[PDB]
């Protein structure tokens, strides 16, 4: 009767190339099944590991057990470039926490990081800490991106549209 769920560990749904991603299937024989773009992969452990991500590892992922049904598709985006603003989702309920991360390729030296909402700065850090909103207001909706000193060059990340909902 119960239905399986795919779990991203860590939470970030958009990652860069060469990153490490672990997908976990929940449910309850102790085998599992994994599918990518509606296509079974041969890994039948409870957790599927991506040691170094490539852009073709993108797409939706589904999993099932012999004691659970087919899960709902969990999308994954493997992005190219040097900088990337990471989020666990892109739609938030009001008063929920928003945890963002400005991540560099293979964690290359990242300093002077700035998080921006609608082309205006929100938080500045000397090193490379995470951006956090404890309780989401409706004014926190908009386009987010980060910018910092990746080694020697100033890099601006891509845009992520975050929308705050009410009911």
């Amino acid at each position, epitope marked *: 009767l119960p239905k399986a769920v795919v779990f991203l*560990e*860590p*939470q970030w749904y958009r990652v860069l190339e060469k990153d490490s991603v*672990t997908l976990k299937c929940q449910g309850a024989d102790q085998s599992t099944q994994w599918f990518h773009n509606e296509s079974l992969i041969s890994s039948q452990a409870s957790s599927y590991f991506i040691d170094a991500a490539t852009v073709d590892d993108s797409g939706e992922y589904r999993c099932q057990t012999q004691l659970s049904t087919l899960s709902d598709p969990v999308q994954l985006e493997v992005h190219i470039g040097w900088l990337l603003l990471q989020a*666990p989702r892109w739609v938030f309920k009001e008063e929920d*926490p928003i*945890h963002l991360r400005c*991540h560099s390729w293979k*964690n290359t030296a990242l300093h002077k990081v700035t998080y921006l909402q609608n082309g205006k700065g929100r938080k500045y850090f000397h*090193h*490379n*800490s*995470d951006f*956090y909103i*404890p*309780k989401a207001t409706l004014k926190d909706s908009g386009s987010y991106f980060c910018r910092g000193l990746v080694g020697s060059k100033n890099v601006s990340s891509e845009t992520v549209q975050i929308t705050i909902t009410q009911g």
Partner: antibody
Amino acid sequence: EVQLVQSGAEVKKPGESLKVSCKASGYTFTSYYMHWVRQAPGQGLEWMGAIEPMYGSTSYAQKFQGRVTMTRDTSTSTVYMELSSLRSEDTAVYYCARGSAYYYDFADYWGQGTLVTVSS
Amino acid sequence: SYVLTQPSSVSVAPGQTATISCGGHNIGSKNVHWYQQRPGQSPVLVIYQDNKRPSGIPERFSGSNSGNTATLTISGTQAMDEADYYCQVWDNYSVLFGGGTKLTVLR
């Protein structure tokens, strides 16, 4: 399960350094922050800082900035805290605490604590 | 820079309900968490995010956050509830604790 086992008690003299370890277990170590909270004898809890174990980013309370140092060893799931220039006021039980829900808004698990007596 | 204000002591008869306050400037703007610390033990999370309860905590523990006062409420208090209770918030990339309230049982 989640376990937080800390190092044993320590005796210190004024001006020395303390370094305490916190071995995590029972979860994905790199997915959760790690708090460090101290409590003087008979006083209340006091936040000292936290560390992001995936990429080593830290954050300290301003009373301990320039004196506290936090590191982690991902291959051993161990978090390290260090405090320099110890005085008798630094006598306290030092706890490590796992940050909940992939940040350090609050702590959902605590270690057993480590007694550090700074005394002549 | 942010200040949380807790009462020093709180006394309650057995079975009766105890309430512990935690004051802060617009504390309703924040999610407030509470910890229980028995005399010589490690702290234990009892309420997180104003009202939510972790697994294994009795339902008689309840939390409320509205205005400039967050409140922890224990219904039928028992001798095990005799401990110190600390409120905690996250403010500008730092974690802060209240002074702590000692729960006393009357007789």
